[PDB]
Amino acid sequence: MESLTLQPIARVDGTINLPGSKSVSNRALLLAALAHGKTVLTNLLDSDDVRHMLNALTALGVSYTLSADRTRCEIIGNGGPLHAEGALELFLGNAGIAMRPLAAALCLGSNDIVLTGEPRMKERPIGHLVDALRLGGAKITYLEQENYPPLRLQGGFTGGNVDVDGSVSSQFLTALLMTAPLAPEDTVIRIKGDLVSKPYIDITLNLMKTFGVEIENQHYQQFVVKGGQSYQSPGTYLVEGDASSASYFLAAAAIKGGTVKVTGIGRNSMQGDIRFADVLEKMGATICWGDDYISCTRGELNAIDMDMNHIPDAAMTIATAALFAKGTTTLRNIYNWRVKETDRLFAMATELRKVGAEVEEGHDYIRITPPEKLNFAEIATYNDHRMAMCFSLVALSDTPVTILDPKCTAKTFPDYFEQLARISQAA
Ligand SMILES: O=C(O)C1=C[C@@H](OP(=O)(O)O)[C@@H](O)[C@H](O)C1
Known part of the structure; x- marks a missing residue:
């Protein structure tokens, strides 16, 4: 010890x-990977949580380069949803802001991917998000304990009317917000009751707008998203x-x-x-x-x-x-x-x-x-x-x-x- x-x-x-913000860094990396164009992120955080997201992108086929101190990242956008088959396993350590957003994002289209992490991650809840993704059409399987990672994602999120519980984690709503714009159909995300950690939702909407997407926020009780959108590289972006x-x-x-x-x-x-x-x-x-x-x-x-x-x-x-x-x-x-x-x-x-x-x-x-x-x-x-x-x-x-x-x-x-x-x- x-x-x-x-x-x-x-x-x-x-x-x-x-050092760079972990919350902004992981959101920026995922949006940059989904976007069209090359994004240059500066002041990116070099830490385990960001390294797991980077490793996940590498595994999904996304191309990028890092500066010597790993704080500058030049990402080649995939121009659309990321894809992998064969139950590819992505190890996400204990990074909630990698696990939750990816769980949702990888439900777009078809895929066969497994998300897992360290022992504690298999004890952090994700059922509220899975419930919401399924209402939108996603096929998701709990490989171990019901309501917790690891998850096998087989795609199918098309959009529609989706309810999501916001009383335990704002990360579930964040994940849905980032994913919904790329879905083929419009989505209406209805919050069931209370919403905790509300300021993190503002971080999510801010990053989405930077990458070219806006949605209709109705007093945080309901979010109206237009489907069929595309994220676009903002060029050079400074991570707070x-x-x-x-x-x-x-x-x-x-x-x-x-x-x-x-x-x-x-x-x-x-x-x-x-x-x-x-x-x-x-x-x-x-x-x-x-x-x-x-x-x-x-x-x-x-x-x-x-x-x-x-x-x-x-x-x-x-x-x-x-x-x-x-x-x-x-x-x-x-x-x-x-x-x-x-x-x-x-x-x-x-x-x-x-x-x-x-x-x-x-x-x-x-x-x-x-x-x-x-x-x-x-x-x-x-x-x-x-x-x-x-x-x-x-x-x-x-x-x-x-x-x-x-x-x-x-x-x-x-x-x-x-x-x-x-x-x-x-x-
Ligand atoms: O969206 C984010 O960047 C985060 C939101 C918070 O989680 P909860 O919404 O579960 O409180 C926070 O604790 C976590 O470290 C990062």
């Missing part, structure tokens, strides 16, 4: 040029820096700054996680916005009680930052933390208690009362990049912390520890 021990960080200050990855650095400043500036995202970003900065501001930190940066300067840190459904990923960062806040912090309406890289509510509560906090693990919320002083702990990371990055913040105290399997951060941020070290100061 590899591990990394972080010595206490007296102060953080500096600037971080953010990752706002979720930025949360760690901004929070570090709110806790132990100094001023930390992250570049690659700014006030105009399409990512919902830039709203994480608003939370730090509510806690007492000072935030500065620029066109291509967001900075946070230490002020004070007070506990908050907020619905975090709009920033589920970056919200985890507030859970460990809560260790340094005055009072008890409560993060609500975050049930789907349970069906992600790991069950994050169980994982976060378990590890927070190890460093001394009193924690109520609610069914869909978490309440954290910090200790007078933190204690040393060896943190388990549950093959979850964010557990490693969230707990790295424990070192912004008088105690070191040991993080197990630090390389799990490579899911979205391979250089995480070197970047945190860059802003870590002794004086």
Whole structure:
């Protein structure tokens, strides 16, 4: 078991040029592969999740080239739905934003493809999406547990009236939105009830428009899509820096700054996680916005009680930052933390208690009362990049912390520890 021990960080200050957004990167790659023309993506993220999508495209016959640092990708569009037969197996690690979009996209036309991934991916739900794809005509088979990957996709999605449950993951709707335009018939996607992680739907619509397609959004309750469309290369496209990855650095400043500036995202970003900065501001930190940066300067840190459904990923960062806040912090309406890289509510509560906090693990919320002083702990990371990055913040105290399997951060941020070290100061 590899591990990394972080010595206490007296102060953080500096600037971080953010790695590319994972959400934008994987959407851009799939749309570029489906589009007509050559797309040049810059500031693309090089991480496991993106590497799995790239490997999937390679397996499906898509041609592309990568720069030496793998952040520039020149993709030759396929000019239409991707195809493969013979139950070709695509291994997608634990990349939700590869698995969900591909599950839908590969239902166009005929195909015989199997999507699978790491053990945990076979435990992350996909039934809501499969249900919707089938209503549209797709033939999909669960090869193991009903409602979960692996899936054997044999095509047939033609369009029509499709209902989709949006209460567990917005990724299902995202997958349908990206796929429907290329279907032969018009599609009306009706959301059954609530829609969680709504801001990610906006990311999806933004990317689709960049690639030439627009749809009719009726207050997020129903989406009217015209079929028979084609995605078109936007030429050169700049992938925004990752706002979720930025949360760690901004929070570090709110806790132990100094001023930390992250570049690659700014006030105009399409990512919902830039709203994480608003939370730090509510806690007492000072935030500065620029066109291509967001900075946070230490002020004070007070506990908050907020619905975090709009920033589920970056919200985890507030859970460990809560260790340094005055009072008890409560993060609500975050049930789907349970069906992600790991069950994050169980994982976060378990590890927070190890460093001394009193924690109520609610069914869909978490309440954290910090200790007078933190204690040393060896943190388990549950093959979850964010557990490693969230707990790295424990070192912004008088105690070191040991993080197990630090390389799990490579899911979205391979250089995480070197970047945190860059802003870590002794004086
Ligand atoms: O669409 C996306 O890029 C993502 C949406 C979120 O999933 P849910 O919709 O299930 O919350 C998020 O947690 C995931 O890391 C990426």
